[PDB]
Amino acid sequence: MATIHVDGKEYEVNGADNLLEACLSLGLDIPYFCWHPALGSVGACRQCAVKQYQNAEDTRGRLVMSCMTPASDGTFISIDDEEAKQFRESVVEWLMTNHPHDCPVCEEGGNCHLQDMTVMTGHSFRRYRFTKRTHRNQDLGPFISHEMNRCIACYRCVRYYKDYADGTDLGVYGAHDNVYFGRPEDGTLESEFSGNLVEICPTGVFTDKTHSERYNRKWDMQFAPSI
């Protein structure tokens, strides 16, 4: 439908789509968290940053969010722009400042989008030397476990549980960096589709308790397509 120019190479994409969706569908890799193919685009984590030029002669473009930018015809964007790469790594660094050192004891290890993006952004060195924020967890019933410390405030859970599944017991509480995602009070999630949170959450705040009892890493699982 529309012709875009990513890193010089030209591509034919649907103009009705956003650059993130378009480039991801082209096989191009752009880190992201807040955006979900079914929940739409909001522009919160600011991770899908891409440099956009006004024309082919523009050499000083601007950092835009691919998820909140239309894949319009005549669009010149660069994912490999140094500034874009630096900003995308900085977003991960800011999310890692208050992130718990609990990879070995979390159930998302090896299946974690945050782990995948940290590596994709090439962020392996910590410069932050201050304290990490902590949050007390809640009981969410017999199926979902809570570990708010591992949160990155992408808002995916509240957007799926409340704006897609129309649930009323999950919400975002607090302000600034003390934002909390959970129930207004300890209790069982009442949505018949609460389980999808385990795959929606890009971290390990929401996990599957039914598996946690006999937990095994994704690489050690024998899987089969079943109905």
Partner 1 sequence: FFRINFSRCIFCGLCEEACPTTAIQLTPDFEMGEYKRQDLVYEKEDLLISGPGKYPEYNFYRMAGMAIDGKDKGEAENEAKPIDVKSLLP
Partner 2 sequence: AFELSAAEREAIEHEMHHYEDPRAASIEALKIVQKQRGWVPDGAIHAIADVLGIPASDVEGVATFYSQIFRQPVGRHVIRYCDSVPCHINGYQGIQAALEKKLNIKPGQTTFDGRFTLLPTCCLGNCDKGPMMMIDEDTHAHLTPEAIPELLERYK
Partner 3 sequence: AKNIIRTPETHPLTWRLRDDKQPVWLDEYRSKNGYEGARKALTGLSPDEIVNQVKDAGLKGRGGAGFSTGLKWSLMPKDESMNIRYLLCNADEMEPGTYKDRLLMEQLPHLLVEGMLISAFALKAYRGYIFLRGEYIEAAVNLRRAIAEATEAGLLGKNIMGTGFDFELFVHTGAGRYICGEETALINSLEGRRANPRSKPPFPATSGAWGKPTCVNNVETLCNVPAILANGVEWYQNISKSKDAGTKLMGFSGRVKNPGLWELPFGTTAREILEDYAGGMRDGLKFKAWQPGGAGTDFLTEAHLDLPMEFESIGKAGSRLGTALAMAVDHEINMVSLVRNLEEFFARESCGWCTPCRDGLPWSVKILRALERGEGQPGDIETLEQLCRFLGPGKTFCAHAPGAVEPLQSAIKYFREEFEAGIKQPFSNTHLINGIQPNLLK
Residues within the interface to ligand SF4 (CB under 6 A): 99-100, 102-103, 106, 108-109, 112, 114-115, 150-157, 181, 201-205
Q: Does 181 bind ligand FES (CB under 6 A)?
A: no
Cα 87-107-221 angle, rounded to 5 deg: 110
- Scan residues 27-56 and list those touching ligand FES (CB under 6 A): 32-35, 43-48
What is the rounded distance in angstroms from the CA atom of residue 221 to the CA atom of residue 227?
18
Among 2, 96, 120, 172, binds partner 2 (CB under 8 A): 172
- The partner in contact with residue 193, picked from partner 2, ligand FES, partner 3, none with C-beta cut-offs of 5 to 8 angstroms by kind, is none
State the SS3 of 24-82: HHHCCCCCCCCCECCCECCCCCCCCEEEEECCCCCCCCEEEEHHHCECCCCEEEECCCH
**What does the binding site for partner 3 look like in residue numbers (CB under 8 A)?**
42-47, 49, 62-64, 68, 86-87, 90-91, 94-95, 97-98, 126-130, 152-153, 155, 172, 174-179
Q: Is 23 among the annotated ligand-binding positions?
A: no
CA dihedral in degrees (212, 217, 220, 221; nearest 10)? 50
Token pair for residue 127? 């410069």
Q: Does 159 bind partner 1 (CB under 8 A)?
A: no
Could you count the other beta carbons within 10 Å of the beta carbon of residue 104? 6
Q: For residue 221, what are the contacts with CB-CB under 8 A and spacing of at least 6? A: none
Q: Does 147 bind partner 1 (CB under 8 A)?
A: yes
- Smallest gap, in angstroms, from Cβ of residue 203 to partner 3? 13
Question: Of the two residues 36 and 51, which places its CB atom closer to ligand SF4 in the complex?
Answer: 36
- The partner in contact with residue 134, picked from partner 1, partner 2, ligand SF4, none with C-beta cut-offs of 5 to 8 angstroms by kind, is partner 1
Q: Is 201 among the annotated ligand-binding positions?
A: yes
Nearest to 204 by CA among 184, 178, 181, 173: 181
Question: Of the two residues 53 and 94, which places its CB atom closer to partner 3 in the complex?
Answer: 94
The count of residues interacting with partner 1 (CB under 8 A) is 24
Q: Is 157 among the annotated ligand-binding positions?
A: yes
The overall longest dimension of the chain from CA atoms, in Å, is 59
Annotated binding site for [2Fe-2S] cluster: 34, 45, 48, 67
